[PDB]
Design a protein around this ligand. Structure first.
Ligand SMILES: [Mg+2]
Ligand SMILES: [Mg+2]
Ligand SMILES: [Mg+2]
Ligand SMILES: [Mg+2]
Ligand SMILES: [Mg+2]
Ligand SMILES: [Mg+2]
Ligand SMILES: [Mg+2]
Ligand SMILES: [Mg+2]
Ligand SMILES: [Mg+2]
Ligand SMILES: [Mg+2]
Ligand SMILES: [Mg+2]
Ligand SMILES: [Mg+2]
Ligand SMILES: [Mg+2]
Ligand SMILES: [Mg+2]
Ligand SMILES: [Mg+2]
Ligand SMILES: [Mg+2]
Ligand SMILES: [Mg+2]
Ligand SMILES: [Mg+2]
Ligand SMILES: [Mg+2]
Ligand SMILES: [Mg+2]
Ligand SMILES: [Mg+2]
Ligand SMILES: [Mg+2]
Ligand SMILES: [Mg+2]
Ligand SMILES: [Mg+2]
Ligand SMILES: [Mg+2]
Ligand SMILES: [Mg+2]
Ligand SMILES: [Mg+2]
Ligand SMILES: [Mg+2]
Ligand SMILES: [Mg+2]
Ligand SMILES: [Mg+2]
Ligand SMILES: [Mg+2]
Ligand SMILES: [Mg+2]
Ligand SMILES: [Mg+2]
Ligand SMILES: [Mg+2]
Ligand SMILES: [Mg+2]
Ligand SMILES: [Mg+2]
Ligand SMILES: [Mg+2]
Ligand SMILES: [Mg+2]
Ligand SMILES: [Mg+2]
Ligand SMILES: [Mg+2]
Ligand SMILES: [Mg+2]
Ligand SMILES: [Mg+2]
Ligand SMILES: [Mg+2]
Ligand SMILES: [Mg+2]
Ligand SMILES: [Mg+2]
Ligand SMILES: [Mg+2]
Ligand SMILES: [Mg+2]
Ligand SMILES: [Mg+2]
Ligand SMILES: [Mg+2]
Ligand SMILES: [Mg+2]
Ligand SMILES: [Mg+2]
Ligand SMILES: [Mg+2]
Ligand SMILES: [Mg+2]
Ligand SMILES: [Mg+2]
Ligand SMILES: [Mg+2]
Ligand SMILES: [Mg+2]
Ligand SMILES: [Mg+2]
Ligand SMILES: [Mg+2]
Ligand SMILES: [Mg+2]
Lengths: 271, 46
RNA sequence: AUGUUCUAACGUUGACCCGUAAUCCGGGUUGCGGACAGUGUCUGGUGGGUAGUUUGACUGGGGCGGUCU
RNA sequence: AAUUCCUUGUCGGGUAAGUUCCGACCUGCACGAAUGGCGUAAUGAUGGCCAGGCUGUCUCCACCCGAGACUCAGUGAAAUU
RNA sequence: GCUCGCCGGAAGACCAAGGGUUCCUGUCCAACGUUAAUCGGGGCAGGGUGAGUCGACCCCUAAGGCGAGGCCGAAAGGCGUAGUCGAUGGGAAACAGGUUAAUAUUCCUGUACUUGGUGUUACUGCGAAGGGGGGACGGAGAAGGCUAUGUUGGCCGGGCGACGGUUGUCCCGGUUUAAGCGUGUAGGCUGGUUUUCCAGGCAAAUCCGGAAAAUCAAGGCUGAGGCGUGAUGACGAGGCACUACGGUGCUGAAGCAACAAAUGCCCUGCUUCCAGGAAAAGCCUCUAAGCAUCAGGUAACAUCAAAUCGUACCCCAAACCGACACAGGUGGUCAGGUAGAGAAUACCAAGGCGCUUGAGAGAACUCGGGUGAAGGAACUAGGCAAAAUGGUGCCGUAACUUCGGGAGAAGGCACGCUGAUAUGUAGGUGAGGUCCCUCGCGGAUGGAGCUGAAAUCAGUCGAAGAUACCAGCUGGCUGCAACUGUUUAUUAAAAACACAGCACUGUGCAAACACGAAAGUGGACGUAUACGGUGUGACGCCUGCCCGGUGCCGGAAGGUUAAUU
RNA sequence: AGGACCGAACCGACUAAUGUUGAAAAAUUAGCGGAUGACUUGUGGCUGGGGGUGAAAGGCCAAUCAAACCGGGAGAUAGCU
RNA sequence: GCGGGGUGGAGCAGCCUGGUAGCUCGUCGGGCUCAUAACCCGAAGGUCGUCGGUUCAAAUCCGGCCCCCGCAACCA
């Protein structure tokens, strides 16, 4: 549910919170946790390679099952959990053989719901099948791009793909971007949409809330000196040049895709 | 006011000590120069 | 010269086996691509991203104007 | 007008008297709509202006208490030439 | 030595880091010491640091470093796997009293504890480079229960006062005791227990996970404090005897209770929130290969071992960082009284100091303060500076507003002491007794003592009762930036930067993009509700016309046009 | 509850005066701002010079910064003093 | 200081590249209408800022003057 904070201080006036009462209040399932320490956006040369990354809260990594290859064995949803590592919530599921795993939580999934993977699974949200076995027109998420590799497409809160066509060995997918893409029919997908669609309605409200998420400030190129950035310079507010990145490439319209290896799979670009 | 030299024996030894010098070709060139010059104290190691 | 089809070069940041106590690497089996991609030499375009430099003299101070055979 | 040269524009307010301030006017040298326009409660060691209190800020200084300056003994510089 | 003054959330004490003999004694005073020096952190000589338990080392890992092979690179080299290092983090165990000139949880005295070896006994399934558990984790908040600690009474020992009074409702001092071991408490958490099964935990497992059944309800785990013992002891005022008159020797009373009470402890708890909160070993358990009257395991005794290195002294400083015995800088720990909300402030304790030139004088002028007739911003670029305001309770409070604010708006009134209510009240705390019980560290009753606001009424002193210290000036109109934040170390703190929000635009994952001759790495163990770039800058009302130029995007006939031939 | 309020420690640096051969190559005194957070701080680590890092001031990178320091080319060159 | 412009009543061409004044609107005359506007048909109207120079000949080319626009007017 989406709740607007009362303006008892100027940092609270604009805050809008997404509060989900279904989420587990306790600690996560410890056998499926590992550490993931922070980078500051620095590579193995030690240099900043992605700007504006630093600080924020410590976070444990939850091992999420994006492969969904434990076929033929039913699982029951134990609880939904907050995952700091992504926009979607995750669900702890218990397989009938006694194994527990985390999955991405689809829309509508609640504790006690039964799920299954494999060729003979029912066409029901949270069930995973090869897209050969999934009806054309279906909404799916967590879509594999290569068979066995694990889901890579439509994993963010509220996302999904539509299976628009099936032609031999391949299915055509409409992606959230608007791209039409071919994928091998043996690739798995999970029925339904990713949950937590209200994610996008949140309003952080204040500068510090972005700092908590490990985002450091952006300084505009036009606020700099010429030595620092192409936009830098001027006595007063001046510009008078075509917008570019800090490294001099045009940054308002110029296309940057260059991958002739994967062009064959793209039926229609997002446009 | 806080001045530039803030001593730490661990940082001294790790930064400029004999083993640090020996670890790289350019460090070994430092030692070679200092031996050739005939320095009494090759490194900060004490 | 296009178009298709193929596999056998080449790709794989799919899976699985082995070295092996190892998310490296290599070998193996398979799948998927496939003479494309990518790389080398040559070549047109673009290229203040970067570099080296040039940007005259006269002049009732210099600039600006004017001049220069 | 953080923008207006002419300019202390003009008219009104506030003052005995106001090149500043506030409100109008439009004749915009040379405002203007995300190099955003116009508003805006709250906020500000932010710029302007007005009042009450308060005062040695001032008319216009006086006196006092201490540390130096001054004399004595000891030690003992400097720039410069 | 006596007086005086100063610090006392420090200018006292204890450390770490850093330093290194500055420590303690004798001796010397040339140089050092901003003066003299008999003195010294100075010179010279001698002395002084004692550990199974404190720390290091050691075991374990974080970020990170190095890195067999490997991959890559003219060379040098780069990157990285297996590994191996790397604390600022996890991992056994000791306390009290006494002692030196100078060390002490180290010496000594008393009383403990821990881990390993080895042996005798009694049993007995042991076995890991593997599985599982545990270690093991956030912020804020709220309490209850305690204690350190203090206060007062009682008790004990001393006093009966330089000047009126002072055998008391009087004055001064003491009233201290550990670890350990027993107890298992206030409180926290958790149903036990037994059977049967089983696509899981890289193989197995009796372990863990799951499933189905019995059975029964108290099982267990954790835990401050208290209490008991340790302790017939230790310590103890003060007296007494020496004295080398510095100090040693000797002895030794009382040693309780109530109340108050931490920011410490229970508490790694509990409640709640979103930003979702290390790792590995020790440790516990399970088995595999193996071994099987052998090892191995476990228990109980008995012995033996616990090496090495640090340990002086300074440490908010004259010993460290600042060229100085330099108004500077420097992490952690301790936390007495009265007043107070308080770690503010004032005065004090314990403790420590008077800051290494003095003596006079009492000119101008400079510095830091005090007070000022009448006036009251006339000063000045400008109320700059100073003056003023200041507490608590109550009454009261405007425009405007995003309904939170504005607001401590503004303005006002009370305030000391003494008595009464009430020889001390409401409250808090609670002894004995009285009972009850699954007899405890139990319950109920009960109220002794102890503590103790706040108010009203009545008096009363002063010029003045928030008397000192301490402690908002306030209002009106306006520009700019929404706000909190950031910035030119050392002349600019702002209207600049950032910001939540907005928009454009790239990017389909081997993403774009960035660092890298490369291999790789970041982006991200993310996936378009995601990431990157660019502009704008909360919110409200909105954001008009122009594609000629110049960029970009799309097209692709025609012309022109490279290497090539 | 809160980048809430008032206020010590702590972090900072708005005003004045002093100092300016300083007590000090950036301080002191009196006032001043934040003070549960985009806070502050210890210990270790990482990024290297046309390079880093920068809530952006050409700031900072050992009292040095519109291109650090050190050594070398090196007795650079100097129609200039 | 440096560029630019002064052409029928209005706005605007013709200047370069000497001989030659165009365009749209307005004006006037006739029509259409009951009248007016509209609309139709026919006309008139700038020796070209002024003054000189040059040339066989000047809107034109050169110079002065007058007028009206720009720009520039700086560093201590
Ligand atoms: Mg994240
Ligand atoms: Mg942004
Ligand atoms: Mg700038
Ligand atoms: Mg540039
Ligand atoms: Mg400008
Ligand atoms: Mg250039
Ligand atoms: Mg050259
Ligand atoms: Mg040049
Ligand atoms: Mg010249
Ligand atoms: Mg003016
Ligand atoms: Mg006036
Ligand atoms: Mg006005
Ligand atoms: Mg503007
Ligand atoms: Mg627009
Ligand atoms: Mg003298
Ligand atoms: Mg104090
Ligand atoms: Mg010595
Ligand atoms: Mg001494
Ligand atoms: Mg002498
Ligand atoms: Mg002397
Ligand atoms: Mg000495
Ligand atoms: Mg490592
Ligand atoms: Mg390496
Ligand atoms: Mg090697
Ligand atoms: Mg190790
Ligand atoms: Mg340590
Ligand atoms: Mg001592
Ligand atoms: Mg007590
Ligand atoms: Mg506290
Ligand atoms: Mg000591
Ligand atoms: Mg000092
Ligand atoms: Mg001194
Ligand atoms: Mg500090
Ligand atoms: Mg005097
Ligand atoms: Mg004075
Ligand atoms: Mg005064
Ligand atoms: Mg007066
Ligand atoms: Mg008076
Ligand atoms: Mg005046
Ligand atoms: Mg005057
Ligand atoms: Mg003032
Ligand atoms: Mg004052
Ligand atoms: Mg104004
Ligand atoms: Mg602001
Ligand atoms: Mg601020
Ligand atoms: Mg400055
Ligand atoms: Mg990658
Ligand atoms: Mg802006
Ligand atoms: Mg703006
Ligand atoms: Mg606050
Ligand atoms: Mg600062
Ligand atoms: Mg300043
Ligand atoms: Mg101060
Ligand atoms: Mg504030
Ligand atoms: Mg405050
Ligand atoms: Mg510097
Ligand atoms: Mg250079
Ligand atoms: Mg040379
Ligand atoms: Mg020379």
């Amino acid at each position: 549910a989406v709740v607007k904070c009362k303006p008892t201080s100027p940092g609270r006036r604009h805050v809008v919170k997404v509060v989900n009462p279904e989420l587990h209040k306790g600690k996560p399932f410890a056998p499926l946790l590992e550490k993931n320490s922070k980078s500051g956006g620095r590579n193995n040369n030690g240099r900043i390679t992605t700007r504006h990354i630093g600080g924020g809260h410590k976070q444990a990594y939850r091992i999420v099952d994006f492969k969904r290859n434990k076929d033929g064995i039913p699982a029951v949803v134990e609880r939904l959990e907050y995952d700091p590592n992504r926009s979607a919530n995750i669900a702890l599921v218990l397989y009938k053989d006694g194994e527990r795993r985390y999955i991405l939580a689809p829309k509508g999934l609640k504790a006690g719901d039964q799920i299954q993977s494999g060729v003979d699974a029912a066409i029901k949200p949270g069930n995973t099948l090869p897209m050969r076995n999934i009806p054309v027109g279906s909404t799916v998420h967590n879509v594999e791009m290569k068979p066995g590799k694990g889901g890579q497409l439509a994993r963010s809160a509220g996302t999904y793909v539509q299976i628009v066509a099936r032609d031999g060995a391949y299915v055509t997918l409409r992606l959230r971007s608007g791209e039409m893409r071919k994928v091998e029919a043996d690739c798995r997908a999970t029925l339904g949409e990713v949950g937590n669609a209200e994610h996008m309605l949140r309003v952080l409200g204040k500068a510090g809330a972005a700092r908590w998420r490990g985002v450091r400030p952006t300084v505009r190129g036009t606020a700099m000196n010429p030595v620092d950035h192409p936009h830098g310079g001027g006595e007063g507010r001046n510009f008078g040049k075509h917008p570019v990145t800090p490294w001099g490439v045009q940054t308002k319209g110029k296309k940057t895709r260059s991958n002739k290896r994967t062009d064959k799979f793209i039926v229609r670009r997002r446009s | 006011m806080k001045r530039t030299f803030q001593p730490s024996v661990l940082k001294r030894n790790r930064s400029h000590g004999f083993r640090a010098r020996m670890a790289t070709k350019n460090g070994r060139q430092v030692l070679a120069r200092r031996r050739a010059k005939g320095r009494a104290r090759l490194t900060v190691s004490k």
